[PDB]
Point group: C4
């Protein structure tokens, strides 16, 4: 077998060490734009998010209301593919035609839209019924697709991406994953993926141990994939955006993920807490909660995972603004006005096993 | 004294990183056959389990019902030697002649059997009364034997194996152990053991600390012994199968043990939970349990250990099938269709002390 | 991004290994004097504390009573700058003119005073209203100033120090910070700071995680900054005193901080517990407590942090004497009669993650 | 300051890996004799314990009854020096003349005795009143002395040993300590100590943190001192026995300490639990306990430490026999018939931070 020189680490094990903060670096001047799909050296990505956040490909997270609310703030949602093809396509259609009208024939500056001023939206696909699902999603106006899988290091993803390239060329964008090391990244890169998703085991509703025992600390996975991605860019001139998917517990984990090289972040739990998630708001002994279940739970694929509750946080807007203000502020502490500058200048340290306690409040009531 | 460069590690500290999964790798096509006894280069083992699981040499685990139920699924049981010679021989006889008849003279495709279609069965032996016990076990039809001891790195095991080789040549198969490093493996190998058992301290009912303070993390022990075993094979052309005995807490620990090089796994607690274990099913406040005690407990050698209870799991069959389906699935994630292929391709990483939390469910109710 | 070879560590992870204790080293002969502001090689600092302790620049810690009580024992207080300029200046004035009289016009041997026998006092300043605040503090008789910030690695601190040097030359002393590595130290050194404050995240009332995720273990930060400070001294002949700010939980952490190279220590919680802190003494179910809130709490900047309680410890005097007696005693165990000698001779070891338990009381009721 | 390449470790972090156990190694044939005082190459120590255990120099442990009971089993006690000179001398006298008679003038094979068949006994001394105390202890018949201190790396110990050598030459044996590294060992060795005591912080009733912050993991201290001791022996031909003092929680820690090179072990808590300790047997809610307080507690030096209770274990004899049987058994697992052979052959591994759980009982009720 093959072993590694170092054990893997998660986001909670790192802290950012400040760099020189210049007078021009104030939160309001920080630009959080980031590339969504691959491009060649010297070019810009055809699709750029205005904020580096995308909602997870999950029944309990990315419905049409979520896709609209997130696109309004500059991010994009990946409508879950764990439903009928007709049903998923309808959600995509509804998001693409939201600015049309509520009836029949009887102003956000950071909104993410296409040349027709329509909100951008993504859609998850699987390696099974893609020959039928993909065309339906394209016709519905889906702006980007993403193969949804726990282990993307599969010949099935290569076949799926190939079928798409052969039928649509580079006109249909498709993300692939998840992978956790350079090998996996490289395989999906050569296969043609437009962006590669990183992460296995990190998800809040994912229990590696009580399952198959596959996975890797999210930080180590990101750092490793990013290095491979950069090597790949140098060899081929092709820059493939990568997504850190899962494991985000605190807002600062977002800054860490971006600093380590992730272009954007995929979150489930974070977004499930919002009013706009498709789940039910349930009140439990004075506490308003929201349902949250993984795609691996029996409750999902009935059309490996856990079914739970997350505290209600209110509307997506105020929460995302609060989170990103903290990211922007930290970026300035690091001397960065943009994500690429942060990825270049960030000073990232690992913290001791016997520590972390000093970081929080201690010896006080 | 002699010290080591690295501290030892247990199974819970590792995770498997996926490899390329090909289209032909589906769980149902995974072959879990594995060698039980040593053979020369270019040959096949005279005895091959159909599944890499064997039940522990314990009074509370391997009785005749267990031996039958496990052999039916492709594994083998080692009838405990902590009983009279006449008593142990009778159990072996009963298993060997089960397909004869229930009265007097008045279709499982993965069953493990001999050329006479009789279920295979093993039997534990000790370094004391082997001159009387061995012959009785052979006459009873025991297919394989195994010296049962916590520290097999002993001249007593060499003497026992020698007496067997001198009286039966290579016609009687005998496993030896337990050992935890290359030195111990090598000693029992040169002594003639047909398979070597790995593990000291890992057992669920074993408390190293509150005892002698001998032992080693099961993962490190396996990895070390396997390297020595491979070196030995290269020098002599003799391949000695090794058994990871104890420390298996979760199903994925099985995949880990095999990936690290263990040919098969010995379990006690896992099998004690089944209907077929010889212990009593006792109901405690709505919870049906089964008794489980170690061979080192006073409750056993009365014919060092602990006496406890394990939750009833039902019949052996459905449980073993569920466990192995998960192993097979993980093997495909690793790009392996067989155990040898898994041992060759597995990518095994250690996980941080400050982690493991990310792996399971977190920040959710 | 930039990574490090070792994870950071906190004070709780270290222990001092004794050196040769000579007959002349008794606690009463230990000199705890230490430099407060920078000087050139061959000179002495214009200001020397008699004890290496200074109270934090916080509303709940350094009021006029605290400044007087601490100066009497040989330390200095930094009157909080999170109040009106007129208000802060009045506190400084009151401390400077305390030995004048209680009415109107109708003997501590370790006291820290100026050439006029008046108690020394410091005052915190910010990078915003310094053009108005500084002059007012100088006129009031402030002996030393200190820019109060969580991330001193800022162009704003350079501008502030510059404005001070241009208007007052080297006649007005100003400390800067906080920083946690050589880079940050070097930047503030070249900027002209008279002393540099070390520490981000360590504070008892500071929660890095639930915030921005910036920081570093206090021990590692001190050790790193001190090495840079020593390198800087060798290159320029300028010795810049450094302050370990925050993270002190136990008295021995004080000895550790000094041994690692910190010239003096800044504490908040430690001093808040005293009668002389400006907060209210509140009795909670038989326990007399004192309020303690960080400057980052909403309760403070209303003229990021937490509001809490700390157990009442009584008057500053008896507590500081008890603490320093322990430091002095430990210094002799290390063969040191002075702080510089301790920094030179201390033998400092890191302790294992799996330990620390042996250090305290164990296996006893 | 001076730092180290590795963090220190305690006994709980190690396990012994078995070696070849020969047929002649049975517990009853294991010899636990060990040297108490220094000797030259080619010679034997003038005093050899029959078992490697000595009771701590504590008021709550080593009284006359303890000294008698322990000497009967082959060990020696160090009558506490924290009492009047007349009082301590009387205890020594009583032990030396126990085989005389209970009234006035009106058969253990492992007993430790002198040429007059009298039980051996030791006595602790301090660096203060030794000019009066020593003569009184010698006249009383004390067989060996030991300077009692938490930091033996002191010029005071050199002066004390010197005064003894000048007045008695090498006729009076005196141990010194405690130290935790090669430097300290070397200093007391050159000073003339007959044996050197290792350990600071390990004691069950010692709380390093809540004190001065001096100390080192007991295992690391022993390993380091032993290496220095062996180097010293090679350079001078003088073999100085060393004592691992404190930190023994389990019986296997005894085997570990000896395997790492300690010639003998000093214990406090272990012996306090016995009927023969001078403290009071107190019954607390059905549990018979014994008082146990450190020499650093105010309760002691009233003629830094804690006052507590330890569960009653009964008579010293049965307990020491049980403990040593386990040590002897483990020694055979390691292929050792004597302590020197164990120190030479022991294979000692460190165990992972994330482990230790596997070692004990797990996943069972
Ligand atoms: C597919 O959605 C995921 C993803 C993206 C991830 C994980 C996961 O468990 C599931 C659910 C797993 C399912 C439905 C089993 C099918 C499969 O193999 O894909 C994970 O651990 O990392 C990433
Ligand atoms: C023999 O069965 C075992 C085995 C196989 C192992 C251990 C163990 O404790 C016992 C019971 C120990 C007994 C009955 C003491 C006799 C002996 O020395 O064999 C263990 O720790 O690793 C493996
Ligand atoms: C300024 O006072 C501090 C200091 C000195 C430190 C920290 C901190 O949180 C605050 C409060 C932080 C505030 C009021 C936000 C403004 C700022 O950015 O300065 C810390 O973590 O290390 C040192
Ligand atoms: C002297 O007895 C000890 C010993 C042997 C040790 C320690 C200790 O705390 C005390 C009590 C400490 C006292 C009475 C203070 C006087 C002194 O300095 O000796 C310890 O930590 O390691 C070893
Ligand atoms: N284990 C499951 O059932 C399941 N369902 C989804 N997931 C993974 O977890 C991610 C969400 O993680 P989280 O809640 O944001 O930590 C998803 O985008 C996906 O990669 N895991
Ligand atoms: N300590 C004991 O009393 C005892 N009895 C059996 N054992 C060991 O534990 C193994 C079972 O481990 P487990 O329950 O499967 O974790 C046995 O095969 C044996 O090697 N240990
Ligand atoms: N987080 C906050 O609100 C806050 N307020 C003050 N501080 C920092 O904490 C220090 C006090 O730490 P402590 O209480 O002594 O551990 C201050 O000197 C400052 O550097 N942090
Ligand atoms: N801290 C104290 O008050 C105190 N008193 C004794 N000791 C140390 O602890 C040892 C006993 O340790 P333990 O109880 O056996 O773990 C003593 O021999 C001595 O070195 N420490
Ligand atoms: K900065
Ligand atoms: K795969
Ligand atoms: K000393
Ligand atoms: K052995
Ligand atoms: Na903190
Ligand atoms: Na998880
Ligand atoms: Na202790
Ligand atoms: Na165990």
């Amino acid at each position: 077998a093959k072993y590694y020189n170092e054990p893997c680490h998660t986001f909670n094990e790192y802290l950012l060490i400040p760099g020189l903060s210049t007078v021009d670096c104030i939160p309001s001047n920080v630009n959080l734009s980031t590339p969504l799909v691959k491009f060649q050296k010297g070019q810009q990505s055809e699709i750029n998010l205005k904020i580096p956040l995308v909602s997870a490909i999950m029944q309990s997270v990315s419905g049409e209301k979520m896709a609209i609310a997130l696109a309004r703030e500059g991010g994009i949602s990946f409508i879950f593919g764990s439903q009928s093809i007709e049903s998923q396509a309808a959600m995509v259609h509804a998001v693409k035609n939201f600015k049309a009208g509520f009836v029949v024939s009887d102003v956000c500056h950071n909104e993410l839209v296409d040349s027709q001023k329509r909100y951008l939206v993504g859609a998850g696909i699987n390696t099974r019924d893609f020959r039928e699902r993909v065309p339906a999603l394209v016709e519905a106006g889906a702006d980007v697709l993403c193969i949804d899988s726990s282990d993307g290091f599969s010949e099935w993803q290569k076949i799926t991406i190939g079928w798409i390239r052969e039928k649509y060329g580079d006109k249909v964008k498709v993300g692939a994953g998840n992978i956790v090391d350079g090998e996996g990244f490289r395989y999906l890169a050569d296969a043609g993926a437009d962006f590669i998703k990183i992460g296995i085991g990190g998800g809040s509703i994912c229990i590696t141990r009580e399952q198959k025992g596959i996975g890797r600390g999210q930080a180590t996975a990101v750092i490793d994939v990013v290095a491979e991605r950069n090597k790949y860019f140098e060899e081929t001139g092709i820059y493939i955006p990568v997504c850190s998917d899962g494991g985000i517990v605190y807002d600062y984990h977002m800054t860490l993920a971006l600093a380590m090289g992730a272009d954007f972040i995929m979150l489930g739990r974070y977004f499930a807490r919002f009013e706009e998630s498709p789940t039910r708001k349930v009140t439990i002994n004075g506490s308003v909660m929201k349902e949250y279940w993984g795609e691996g739970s029996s409750r999902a694929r009935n059309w490996e995972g856990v079914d739970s509750y997350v505290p209600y946080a209110g509307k997506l807007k105020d929460n995302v603004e609060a989170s990103l203000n903290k990211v922007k502020s930290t970026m300035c502490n690091c001397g960065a006005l943009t994500i690429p500058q942060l990825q270049s200048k960030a000073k990232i340290t690992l913290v001791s096993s016997v520590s972390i306690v000093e970081g929080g409040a201690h010896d006080v009531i």
